[PDB]
Coordinates of C-alpha atoms and ligand atoms in Angstrom, one line a residue:
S1 CA 32.1 -4.7 2.7
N2 CA 31.5 -2.3 -0.4
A3 CA 27.8 -1.8 -1.2
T4 CA 27.0 0.5 -4.1
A5 CA 24.8 3.5 -3.7
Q6 CA 21.8 1.7 -5.3
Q7 CA 22.4 -1.5 -3.2
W8 CA 22.7 0.6 0.0
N9 CA 19.5 2.6 -0.7
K10 CA 17.4 -0.4 -1.7
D11 CA 14.3 -0.8 0.6
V12 CA 15.8 1.6 3.1
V13 CA 12.9 3.4 4.9
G14 CA 14.4 5.4 7.8
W15 CA 14.0 8.0 10.4
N16 CA 15.7 11.3 11.3
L17 CA 17.1 11.9 14.8
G18 CA 16.0 15.5 14.5
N19 CA 16.7 18.5 16.8
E20 CA 19.4 16.6 18.7
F21 CA 23.0 16.8 17.5
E22 CA 22.4 19.6 15.1
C23 CA 21.3 22.0 17.8
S24 CA 23.4 25.2 18.2
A25 CA 25.5 25.5 21.3
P26 CA 23.5 26.2 24.5
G27 CA 22.1 29.7 24.4
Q28 CA 23.6 30.6 21.0
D29 CA 21.8 32.0 18.0
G30 CA 21.0 29.2 15.6
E31 CA 21.9 31.4 12.6
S32 CA 25.3 32.3 14.0
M33 CA 28.3 31.6 11.7
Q34 CA 30.9 31.5 14.5
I35 CA 33.3 28.6 14.8
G36 CA 34.6 27.6 18.2
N37 CA 33.9 25.5 21.3
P38 CA 31.9 27.4 24.0
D39 CA 31.8 25.8 27.4
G40 CA 28.8 23.5 27.8
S41 CA 28.7 22.8 24.0
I42 CA 29.3 19.1 24.6
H43 CA 25.8 19.0 26.1
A44 CA 24.2 20.8 23.1
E45 CA 21.9 17.9 22.3
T46 CA 19.4 19.3 24.8
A47 CA 19.6 23.0 23.7
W48 CA 16.4 22.9 21.6
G49 CA 14.4 21.1 24.2
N50 CA 14.8 17.4 23.5
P51 CA 16.4 14.8 25.9
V52 CA 19.8 13.2 25.9
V53 CA 19.7 10.3 23.3
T54 CA 19.7 6.8 24.8
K55 CA 20.0 3.3 23.4
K56 CA 16.4 2.6 24.3
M57 CA 15.3 5.4 22.0
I58 CA 17.2 3.9 19.0
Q59 CA 15.7 0.5 19.8
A60 CA 12.2 1.9 19.7
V61 CA 12.7 3.3 16.2
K62 CA 13.9 -0.1 15.1
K63 CA 10.9 -1.9 16.6
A64 CA 8.6 0.5 14.8
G65 CA 9.8 -0.9 11.5
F66 CA 12.6 1.5 10.4
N67 CA 15.9 0.1 9.1
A68 CA 18.1 3.2 8.9
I69 CA 18.6 6.4 11.1
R70 CA 19.9 9.7 9.6
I71 CA 21.7 11.7 12.3
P72 CA 21.9 15.4 11.8
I73 CA 25.1 16.9 13.3
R74 CA 26.3 20.5 13.6
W75 CA 30.0 20.9 14.0
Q76 CA 30.8 24.6 14.2
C77 CA 30.4 24.9 18.0
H78 CA 32.5 21.8 18.6
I79 CA 35.7 23.1 17.0
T80 CA 38.8 23.3 19.3
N81 CA 40.8 25.2 16.6
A82 CA 39.1 27.3 14.0
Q83 CA 42.1 27.5 11.6
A84 CA 42.5 23.7 11.5
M85 CA 38.9 22.8 12.1
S86 CA 39.9 20.3 14.8
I87 CA 37.0 18.6 16.5
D88 CA 36.4 18.3 20.3
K89 CA 37.4 14.7 21.2
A90 CA 34.3 14.3 23.5
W91 CA 31.9 15.4 20.8
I92 CA 33.4 12.7 18.5
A93 CA 33.2 10.1 21.2
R94 CA 29.5 11.1 21.8
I95 CA 28.6 10.7 18.1
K96 CA 30.3 7.3 17.9
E97 CA 28.4 6.1 20.9
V98 CA 25.1 6.9 19.1
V99 CA 26.2 5.5 15.8
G100 CA 27.4 2.4 17.6
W101 CA 23.9 2.0 19.1
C102 CA 22.4 2.1 15.7
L103 CA 24.9 -0.3 14.1
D104 CA 24.6 -2.7 17.1
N105 CA 20.8 -2.8 16.4
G106 CA 20.9 -3.5 12.7
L107 CA 20.4 0.1 11.5
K108 CA 22.1 1.8 8.6
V109 CA 23.4 5.3 9.5
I110 CA 23.8 8.7 7.7
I111 CA 26.1 11.3 9.4
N112 CA 26.3 14.7 7.9
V113 CA 27.2 18.4 8.3
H114 CA 23.9 20.1 9.3
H115 CA 23.0 23.7 10.1
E116 CA 26.7 24.5 9.7
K117 CA 25.9 28.1 9.0
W118 CA 29.3 29.4 8.0
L119 CA 29.0 27.0 5.1
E120 CA 25.3 27.0 4.4
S121 CA 24.8 30.8 4.5
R122 CA 27.8 32.0 2.5
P123 CA 27.6 30.3 -1.0
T124 CA 29.3 33.2 -2.7
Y125 CA 32.6 34.0 -4.4
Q126 CA 33.6 36.2 -1.5
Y127 CA 33.7 33.3 0.9
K128 CA 34.4 30.4 -1.5
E129 CA 38.1 30.0 -0.8
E130 CA 37.5 30.0 3.0
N131 CA 34.5 27.8 3.0
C132 CA 36.2 25.3 0.8
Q133 CA 39.3 25.1 2.9
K134 CA 37.2 24.6 6.0
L135 CA 34.9 22.0 4.5
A136 CA 38.0 20.0 3.5
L137 CA 39.6 20.2 6.9
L138 CA 36.3 19.4 8.7
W139 CA 35.6 16.4 6.4
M140 CA 39.3 15.3 6.6
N141 CA 38.8 15.0 10.4
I142 CA 35.3 13.4 10.3
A143 CA 36.2 10.9 7.6
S144 CA 39.4 9.9 9.4
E145 CA 37.5 9.4 12.7
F146 CA 34.9 7.1 11.1
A147 CA 37.3 5.4 8.6
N148 CA 37.0 2.0 10.2
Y149 CA 33.2 1.8 10.1
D150 CA 31.8 -0.6 7.5
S151 CA 29.5 0.3 4.6
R152 CA 26.3 0.4 6.7
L153 CA 27.6 4.0 7.6
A154 CA 27.2 6.6 4.9
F155 CA 28.5 10.2 4.8
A156 CA 26.3 13.1 3.5
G157 CA 28.5 16.1 2.9
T158 CA 26.2 19.0 3.7
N159 CA 22.6 19.8 4.2
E160 CA 20.6 22.9 3.0
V161 CA 23.0 25.5 1.5
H162 CA 21.3 28.8 0.8
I163 CA 21.5 32.5 1.5
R164 CA 19.6 33.3 4.7
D165 CA 15.9 33.8 4.5
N166 CA 16.1 33.0 0.8
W167 CA 14.5 29.9 -0.6
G168 CA 14.4 30.8 -4.3
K169 CA 16.4 29.6 -7.2
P170 CA 20.2 30.0 -6.7
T171 CA 22.2 32.3 -8.8
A172 CA 24.9 31.0 -11.1
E173 CA 27.3 32.2 -8.4
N174 CA 25.5 30.3 -5.6
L175 CA 25.3 27.1 -7.7
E176 CA 29.0 27.3 -8.7
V177 CA 30.1 27.5 -5.0
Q178 CA 27.6 24.9 -3.7
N179 CA 28.6 22.4 -6.4
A180 CA 32.2 23.0 -5.5
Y181 CA 31.3 21.8 -1.9
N182 CA 30.1 18.5 -3.2
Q183 CA 33.3 18.0 -5.3
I184 CA 35.6 18.9 -2.4
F185 CA 33.7 16.6 0.0
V186 CA 34.1 13.6 -2.4
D187 CA 37.8 14.4 -3.1
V188 CA 38.7 14.7 0.6
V189 CA 36.8 11.5 1.8
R190 CA 38.3 9.4 -1.0
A191 CA 41.8 10.7 -0.1
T192 CA 41.6 9.0 3.3
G193 CA 41.4 5.6 1.6
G194 CA 40.5 2.4 3.5
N195 CA 36.8 1.8 3.9
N196 CA 36.2 5.4 2.7
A197 CA 37.4 4.5 -0.9
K198 CA 34.0 3.0 -1.6
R199 CA 31.8 4.3 1.2
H200 CA 28.4 5.5 0.2
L201 CA 28.7 9.3 -0.2
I202 CA 25.6 11.5 -0.4
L203 CA 25.5 14.8 -2.3
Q204 CA 22.9 17.5 -2.0
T205 CA 21.1 19.7 -4.5
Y206 CA 21.0 23.4 -3.7
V207 CA 19.0 23.9 -0.5
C208 CA 18.0 20.2 -0.9
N209 CA 15.4 21.3 -3.4
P210 CA 15.3 18.8 -6.2
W211 CA 14.0 21.3 -8.8
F212 CA 17.1 23.5 -8.3
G213 CA 19.3 20.6 -9.5
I214 CA 17.2 18.4 -11.7
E215 CA 17.1 20.8 -14.7
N216 CA 19.9 21.8 -17.1
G217 CA 22.6 19.8 -15.2
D218 CA 22.2 22.5 -12.5
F219 CA 23.4 19.8 -10.1
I220 CA 26.9 18.6 -11.2
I221 CA 27.7 15.0 -10.7
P222 CA 31.2 15.0 -9.1
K223 CA 34.1 13.1 -10.4
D224 CA 34.6 10.2 -8.0
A225 CA 37.8 8.2 -7.7
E226 CA 39.1 6.1 -10.7
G227 CA 36.9 3.1 -11.6
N228 CA 34.1 4.1 -9.1
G229 CA 32.1 5.8 -11.8
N230 CA 28.9 7.0 -10.3
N231 CA 28.2 3.8 -8.5
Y232 CA 29.2 5.0 -5.0
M233 CA 27.3 8.4 -4.9
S234 CA 23.7 9.4 -4.4
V235 CA 21.8 12.6 -5.0
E236 CA 20.0 13.8 -1.9
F237 CA 17.0 16.1 -1.8
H238 CA 14.2 16.9 0.7
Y239 CA 10.6 16.4 -0.3
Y240 CA 8.1 18.3 1.8
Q241 CA 5.9 18.5 -1.3
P242 CA 3.5 20.0 -2.2
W243 CA 4.6 22.6 0.4
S244 CA 0.8 23.5 0.7
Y245 CA 0.0 20.2 2.2
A246 CA 2.8 19.1 4.6
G247 CA 4.4 22.5 5.2
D248 CA 2.5 25.8 5.7
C249 CA -1.0 24.3 6.4
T250 CA -2.8 25.8 3.5
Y251 CA -4.7 22.6 2.7
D252 CA -5.7 19.8 5.1
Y253 CA -6.2 17.2 2.3
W254 CA -4.2 15.8 -0.6
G255 CA -4.8 13.6 -3.6
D256 CA -7.6 12.9 -6.0
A257 CA -8.5 10.1 -3.6
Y258 CA -9.5 12.7 -1.0
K259 CA -11.2 15.3 -3.2
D260 CA -14.6 14.6 -1.5
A261 CA -13.1 15.3 1.9
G262 CA -12.2 19.0 1.3
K263 CA -10.1 21.2 -0.9
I264 CA -6.8 19.8 -2.2
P265 CA -3.7 21.3 -3.9
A266 CA -3.2 21.1 -7.6
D267 CA -0.1 18.8 -7.1
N268 CA -1.6 15.3 -6.9
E269 CA -0.5 11.7 -7.1
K270 CA 0.5 12.2 -10.8
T271 CA 2.7 15.3 -10.3
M272 CA 4.6 13.2 -7.7
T273 CA 5.2 10.1 -9.7
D274 CA 6.0 12.3 -12.7
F275 CA 8.7 13.9 -10.6
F276 CA 10.1 10.6 -9.2
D277 CA 10.2 9.3 -12.8
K278 CA 12.2 12.5 -13.8
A279 CA 14.7 11.8 -11.0
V280 CA 15.1 8.3 -12.2
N281 CA 15.8 9.5 -15.8
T282 CA 18.1 12.3 -14.8
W283 CA 20.1 10.5 -12.0
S284 CA 19.4 6.9 -11.3
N285 CA 19.8 5.9 -15.0
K286 CA 23.3 7.3 -14.7
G287 CA 24.1 4.9 -11.8
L288 CA 23.6 7.3 -8.9
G289 CA 21.6 6.5 -5.8
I290 CA 18.6 8.7 -4.7
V291 CA 18.2 9.6 -1.1
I292 CA 15.1 11.5 0.1
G293 CA 16.9 12.6 3.2
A294 CA 13.8 14.4 4.7
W295 CA 10.1 14.3 4.1
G296 CA 7.0 14.5 6.3
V297 CA 3.6 16.1 6.8
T298 CA 3.2 18.4 9.8
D299 CA 0.3 17.5 12.1
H300 CA -2.4 20.1 11.3
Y301 CA -6.2 20.0 11.1
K302 CA -8.9 22.7 10.9
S303 CA -11.9 20.5 11.8
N304 CA -11.9 16.7 11.6
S305 CA -8.7 15.2 12.9
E306 CA -9.7 11.6 12.0
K307 CA -10.4 12.4 8.3
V308 CA -7.1 14.4 8.0
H309 CA -5.0 11.8 9.8
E310 CA -6.4 9.1 7.4
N311 CA -5.4 11.2 4.3
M312 CA -2.0 11.7 6.0
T313 CA -1.7 7.9 6.3
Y314 CA -2.4 7.6 2.5
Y315 CA 0.1 10.4 1.8
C316 CA 2.7 8.6 3.8
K317 CA 2.0 5.3 2.2
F318 CA 2.0 6.7 -1.4
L319 CA 5.3 8.6 -0.9
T320 CA 7.3 5.8 0.8
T321 CA 6.1 3.0 -1.5
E322 CA 6.4 4.9 -4.8
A323 CA 9.9 5.9 -3.8
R324 CA 10.8 2.4 -2.6
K325 CA 9.8 0.6 -5.8
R326 CA 12.1 3.0 -7.7
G327 CA 15.1 2.2 -5.5
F328 CA 15.1 5.4 -3.4
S329 CA 15.8 5.5 0.3
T330 CA 13.5 7.6 2.4
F331 CA 14.1 9.3 5.8
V332 CA 11.1 10.8 7.6
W333 CA 11.7 14.0 9.6
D334 CA 11.0 13.9 13.3
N335 CA 11.6 16.9 15.6
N336 CA 9.6 15.5 18.6
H337 CA 7.0 18.4 18.4
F338 CA 3.3 17.6 18.6
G339 CA 0.2 19.7 18.1
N340 CA -1.6 21.5 15.2
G341 CA 0.4 23.8 13.0
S342 CA 3.9 24.2 11.6
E343 CA 6.9 22.1 12.6
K344 CA 4.8 19.5 14.3
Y345 CA 6.7 16.5 12.9
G346 CA 7.0 14.4 16.0
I347 CA 6.2 10.7 15.6
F348 CA 7.5 9.3 18.9
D349 CA 7.4 11.2 22.3
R350 CA 11.0 11.1 23.4
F351 CA 10.1 12.1 27.0
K352 CA 7.6 9.2 27.5
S353 CA 9.3 5.9 26.8
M354 CA 9.2 6.6 23.0
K355 CA 5.4 6.4 23.0
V356 CA 3.9 6.7 19.5
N357 CA 1.8 9.9 19.5
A358 CA 1.4 9.8 15.7
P359 CA 0.3 6.2 14.8
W360 CA -1.2 7.5 11.5
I361 CA 2.3 8.3 10.2
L362 CA 3.5 4.8 11.2
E363 CA 0.4 3.3 9.5
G364 CA 1.3 5.1 6.2
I365 CA 4.8 3.7 6.0
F366 CA 4.6 0.0 7.3
Ligands
LIG1 O1 11.7 23.9 18.8 C1 13.1 23.8 19.1 C2 13.9 24.6 18.1 O2 13.3 24.5 16.8 C3 14.1 25.1 15.7 O3 13.4 24.8 14.4 C4 13.9 23.6 13.9 C5 12.7 22.7 13.8 O4 12.3 22.2 15.1 C6 13.0 21.4 13.0 O5 11.8 20.7 12.7 C7 13.6 21.9 11.6 O6 13.9 20.7 10.8 C8 14.2 21.0 9.5 C9 15.5 20.4 9.2 O7 16.6 20.8 10.0 C10 15.9 20.6 7.7 O8 17.1 20.0 7.3 C11 14.7 20.1 6.8 O9 15.0 20.2 5.5 O10 13.5 20.8 7.2 C12 13.1 20.6 8.5 C13 11.8 21.3 8.7 O11 12.0 22.7 8.5 O12 14.8 22.6 11.9 C14 14.6 23.8 12.6 C15 16.0 24.5 12.7 O13 16.2 25.3 11.6 C16 14.0 26.6 16.0 O14 14.7 27.3 14.9 C17 14.6 27.0 17.3 O15 14.5 28.3 17.6 C18 14.0 26.1 18.4 O16 14.7 26.3 19.6
LIG2 O1 13.4 27.0 9.1 C1 12.0 27.2 9.0 C2 11.8 28.2 7.9 O2 11.0 27.4 6.9 C3 10.6 28.2 5.8 O3 9.8 27.4 4.9 C4 10.6 26.9 3.8 C5 10.9 25.4 4.1 O4 11.9 25.3 5.1 C6 11.4 24.7 2.8 O5 11.5 23.3 3.0 C7 10.5 25.0 1.6 O6 10.9 24.3 0.4 C8 9.9 24.0 -0.5 C9 9.6 25.1 -1.5 O7 9.3 26.3 -0.8 C10 8.5 24.7 -2.5 O8 8.6 25.6 -3.6 C11 8.7 23.3 -3.0 O9 7.4 22.9 -3.5 O10 9.0 22.3 -2.0 C12 10.2 22.7 -1.3 C13 10.6 21.5 -0.4 O11 9.5 20.8 0.0 O12 10.4 26.4 1.4 C14 9.8 27.1 2.5 C15 9.7 28.5 2.1 O13 9.2 28.7 0.8 C16 9.7 29.4 6.2 O14 9.3 30.1 5.1 C17 10.5 30.2 7.2 O15 9.7 31.3 7.6 C18 11.0 29.4 8.3 O16 11.8 30.2 9.2

């Protein structure tokens, strides 16, 4: 009925329904900050080249072993009225259909506000008043539409807030605005009462980089509703680390265990568990949940695919299990892209009956 953040997160190893409901409107620039409802936008789940989601696809993520699905959702091209941030009824009905598929199959769900560029790209004093008013109206409508779902459904308020093409440390200005987003989100969802009084709410660090929130109280823990304390909130970050493995393909190998295979980044097993410990001390020990809302290693190999895919299996095992035994939930990124380079995070092929074209990832977890 009312699970706490830490209860909800416990043993949750999940999966992202990536590049589906967070696509920009058909034929629109993904960086665009425009709010409206272009014709055809109801079909935007195919705009980036992935299929219409079906029940069978959800069921295959279950059967693989996962127990939660995070659903990224863009809202800005589904707004019937930009002043009030009203949401296209058919878009809501479509989201509920997919959420219902997950819940009917014993999956926990995260729904969020993802690639919402009028919010993510303008964390500045100039746009604060407008972004805050619009975030409130948007979440007022989302929270009210999903008020009657039980606690298996959590809300994450935003995704990666940052100035465009800028992945560095926020300014004081950027931090002030983005922390204000998290507070507004909490206030608005709690003010709809009902099952939202104690629904698991997920808050983000700046650009979902843990290092931009873990120091100096950079990340501000919001004031929740009276008596809730911190027990019904989590801190979310994304953990594509070290970015040299996993991200930009500088190294093909990771860990002291695989030093004999090739060259490895300085960040090893210890730098990871050190960090996880530091997130326990900063946040968990205060009663907050910890959600790793995105992680993964992009499929990339110079020479010896076997040896690289084995090290990837060990990376996936080490990350999931070390997170799990500290009470974190994990959600692996999947964009349904396969190959050898950047942004090759596909696990299942969504065009071929959900066939597992990356068994080495699924060997790492599970
Ligand atoms: O190929 C189809 C479209 O791809 C777009 O890039 C997306 C990537 O495919 C997707 O893997 C990436 O996922 C992000 C995720 O959204 C973010 O929250 C997380 O923290 O990191 C992941 C890895 O970067 O999202 C991007 C969208 O920004 C192209 O931008 C698009 O042109 C193309 O049609
Ligand atoms: O939308 C794709 C864009 O991706 C950019 O790469 C950034 C990643 O999206 C982001 O996840 C990563 O965050 C790293 C951080 O850089 C690193 O210091 C730390 O160790 O881990 C963080 C999370 O794992 O940052 C990179 C950029 O530094 C591309 O740079 C961009 O071209 C592309 O459009």
